[PDB]
């Protein structure tokens, strides 16, 4: 945060509005009590913006030589095996919760439905997210193996 003194003289004659003229008025007001008291009775707090050239931006942004090469680098295959097995197993356990849920859960009063049938930590949604993340990955996995084989030989 950045600050610039105010003169006591300004505050005594109540001439302080001069310093806060023609502005958007966005002031950080985080931190109060003694700190804020001191600030109001001594300095003025105003915004900080960060300006940078696009030359600077690009140098920083650029990463490794091996960055643009990585797609033919591939995971060790013992880990892909492990991952395939973990996902099939996990969904099974949340699927139990989901079957129990739609036994009933067609009455009334929203919040009660969620406590009765464990609609909190909702199983349908948590399952839909895991199922898809794993599905997309497995497309990437195959894609790399086939390409590696064929491109090189």
């Amino acid at each position: 945060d950045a600050f610039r003194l105010i003169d006591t003289g300004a505050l005594i004659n109540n001439l302080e509005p001069r310093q806060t003229t023609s502005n958007t008025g966005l002031l950080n007001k985080a931190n109060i009590q003694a700190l804020i008291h001191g600030l109001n009775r001594h300095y003025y707090s105003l915004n900080i913006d960060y300006h940078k050239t696009a030359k600077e931006t690009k140098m920083l942004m650029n990463l490794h030589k091996e960055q643009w090469q990585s797609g033919l680098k591939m995971y060790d295959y013992e880990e892909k095996e492990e991952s395939n097995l973990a996902a099939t197993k996990s969904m099974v356990k949340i699927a139990e919760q989901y079957s129990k849920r739609i036994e009933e859960e067609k009455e009334l009063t929203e919040e009660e439905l969620k406590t009765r049938y464990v609609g909190r930590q909702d199983p349908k949604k948590h399952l839909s997210e895991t199922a898809d993340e794993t599905l997309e990955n497995n497309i990437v996995s195959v894609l790399t193996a086939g390409v590696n084989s064929v491109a090189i030989k």
Partner: peptide, 10 residues
């Protein structure tokens, strides 16, 4: 082609 299968799916 097996290659084509990934491209069409996406």
């Amino acid at each position: 082609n097996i290659i084509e299968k990934a491209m069409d799916y996406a």
